[PDB]
C-alpha cells in the first residue's frame, strides 16, 4: 500500500473539486500513515491520516483507521496565528479477522465506496436528512 | 432522506459484485436506517445501519454512523443452523459542527469514497499492508 | 402530505420576499416533516415542522400541526459561526372531528389564509395594536 | 385592530366559496375578540376568535392567538338545536419576542398564509395524507 | 413491500368486486403502513394496515401484522353525519424463525389464502358453527 | 362446521404444493378444531386449529381465531425422533359483531385471503420487506 500521492478528485457535493493528500509518511511509534505536503499553512490544512494494525496474537485481526480532517481556519480578526474553530470530518475503522476471506475485506471497502455515493447518505450528509 | 435504490456495486477486487441494500424502514424509536436485501436468509448476516439522521436541540452539532457488515456463515456439520464465523467489517463516523456547511460535508463523503478506490486502500484492505 | 419543495410566494410587510422550502424529511421518531432552506447545519436556518396524524381512541379524534420558524441575530463580529438569539414562529393546530369532511377541514385552511391577509391581523402586527 | 367584518373569499375545498366574519365586542378582560356569521344562529356557529398581545406581566409577549371553528349545524329528527355539531378549532399562534421587528412577524403571518395554499397542507388537512 | 394501492374483490357472497384502498405512508413512530377508502370522511372508510417489521437480534422475529377494518354506518333515520353501527375485523400476526426462512413462509401465507376457502371455516365462520 | 380433512392446494411460493389437515378431534372447548399433517412428526409438528364463538353470554365469548402452526424438524444422520428447529406461525383472529349479517364474516375471510395473495404481503412475508 505504497503511500505515494493519492489525488482525490471529483469530490463535493457535485462531484466538482479536488485535493491534494501527498504523504508525510509513517510514524515509526505506531505505524501510522498520513496524507500532507499541500504547501499550505499546517493544521489549517486538510489532512488524511490512515493507520494500520498487524495481525497481532494480541487482536487476532488486522485494522486500518481512516480519517480524514477538514477543518475550517477563521482566523480571529486581530494578533497573530489562525485557528480552526469548525470541524467538519470522519473517521472509518475497519476491522477484518487474520483469517478473512480477502474478497469480503474488498467488499467492505467498496461497500463504503458505494453508500458514500448513494442518495441516502448523501442527503443525509449533503443535506443533514432525517432518514424515511 | 429516502429510504430508496441503493444498491452498492463495483463490490470485491474484480469491481463487479453487488449488494442491494434498498432500506425498507428505520427503527421507529431511534431514527435509524436498516439496509438490507440481501435476501430473506441472508438479511441476518449481510447488513448495513446508517443512523442518526434526525436533527435535535440536544445535538447541536450533526453526526452520522455508517455500519457495515459482511459475514461469512459457516453450515453446521450434518446439520441445521448455520452462523457467521467471519467479518470483514466497517464503522464510520461522519462529525460536523453545528455551523458547518454542506460542501465541507460533501467533501469528506465523496474524499472517502474517492480514497477507497485510491489503490493506498486496496492494498492496505486485500493485502493487509502497512503504506510501504 | 408530501416531502416536496414547497415555495413560498410573496410575504413580509409588502408581499415582495419568497421562500424555497427544499424538503429534507420527516423526522422518524417524531413522525413529522421537516422542511429547510440552505442544508447547514441549523443555528440561524429557517425551518418548517408538518405532520398530519391519528392519536389513540382516548383522544378519538384528527390533528394536523405545523410550525414555521425564524431566527435571527447579529453578526459574529471579528470571528466565525454567529449563533440564533432571536426566533420568530408560527404554530398551528388544528383540530378536527373524525366525522368532519374534508371540505370543512378545508375551510378551516383556507379562511386562515385569507385571514392572516386581512388589515386586523395586518394591523396587530404593523401597529403591534390589540384587537376589540 | 378594533374589529371589522372581514371577508374571506376563494376559501373551502375548491378555494372559491365566501364566507364574511361580522365582529363582535366586550372590554376584552379575555383577550379574545370575536369576528363570526352575521347569526343570529350562525354567529355562534362559524366564527373566528382573536386574542392580540398587549404582552403579560412577565413582559413577554407580542403575539396573536387566532380559533378558527366551522361547524355543520344539522336539522334532524324534530330537534330544535342544529348549532350543536362537529368540533374543533384550528388553534393559530403567532409566537414573538419582546422586541421583534415587524417585519419579522410580518414574515411569520404571510408565511403561513402562503402555505396553507400549499399542497404540503392541502393534502394533510383535506385528505388526511401522510408525508410519504 | 411498497404501499402502492390495492384493489380486493369478489370477496362477498355475490363475487363481487368492492374494495380499493388508496392513500398510502406509513406511520415511522408506529411502524403502521396504511392503505384505505376516506375520500372525506376517516370514520367511514374500509381500512387494511400492515404493521411493518424490523426485530432485534434478540428476537429475529420479523412479525407483520395486518389489520383489517371493515365499518357499517347509518343516517337511515337523520339529515347528516352518517356514523358506524357494526364492524367487521380481523387481525393477523405472521411469525418468523430465528435464523429466518423462505418456503416455510410461504406455505403459512398460502395457506391461510387456501384455508379460508375451506368448508370447515366456510362454516365455522359464516355460521358461526362449532366444528362438528 | 363438519369436521372433514381440510385439503389445501395452492400452497407455496410457486403455488405447487398441498397440505393436508386430518382431524384430531374438538375439545380445547367443543367444536375447536384440531386438523394435523400426516405421519408421526408432522402429527406433532403441523397443525391449524380454530376458535369457537358462543351463544349469548356477554360478547367476550368471541371470536374466530385460526392458529395455523408450522414447526419443522431437523435431523442427525440415522437419527431417531426429529425434532423442531424452525417454526412458521400465522396467529389470524377474525371479530365480528353478534349481529353481523352472514355477509360480513365471509367477507372478512376473503378479503384476507386477497390480502395474502397481494404483492403487499408476498414482500412483506416471504421477502421480509416492511411496507414504505
Avoid: H, M, W
Amino acid at each position: 500500500a505504497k503511500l505515494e500521492t493519492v489525488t482525490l478528485g471529483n469530490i463535493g457535493k457535485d462531484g466538482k473539486q479536488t485535493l491534494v493528500l501527498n504523504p508525510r509518511g509513517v510514524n515509526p511509534t505506531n505505524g501510522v500513515a498520513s496524507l500532507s505536503q499541500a504547501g499550505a499553512v499546517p493544521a489549517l490544512e486538510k489532512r488524511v491520516t490512515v493507520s494500520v494494525s498487524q495481525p497481532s496474537r494480541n487482536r487476532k485481526n488486522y485494522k486500518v483507521q481512516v480519517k480524514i480532517q477538514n477543518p475550517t481556519a477563521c482566523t480571529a480578526n486581530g494578533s497573530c496565528d489562525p485557528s480552526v474553530t469548525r470541524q467538519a470530518y470522519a473517521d472509518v475503522t475497519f476491522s477484518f479477522t487474520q483469517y478473512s476471506t480477502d474478497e469480503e475485506r474488498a467488499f467492505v471497502r467498496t461497500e463504503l465506496a458505494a453508500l458514500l455515493a448513494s442518495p441516502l447518505l448523501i442527503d443525509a450528509i449533503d443535506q443533514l436528512n432525517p432518514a424515511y
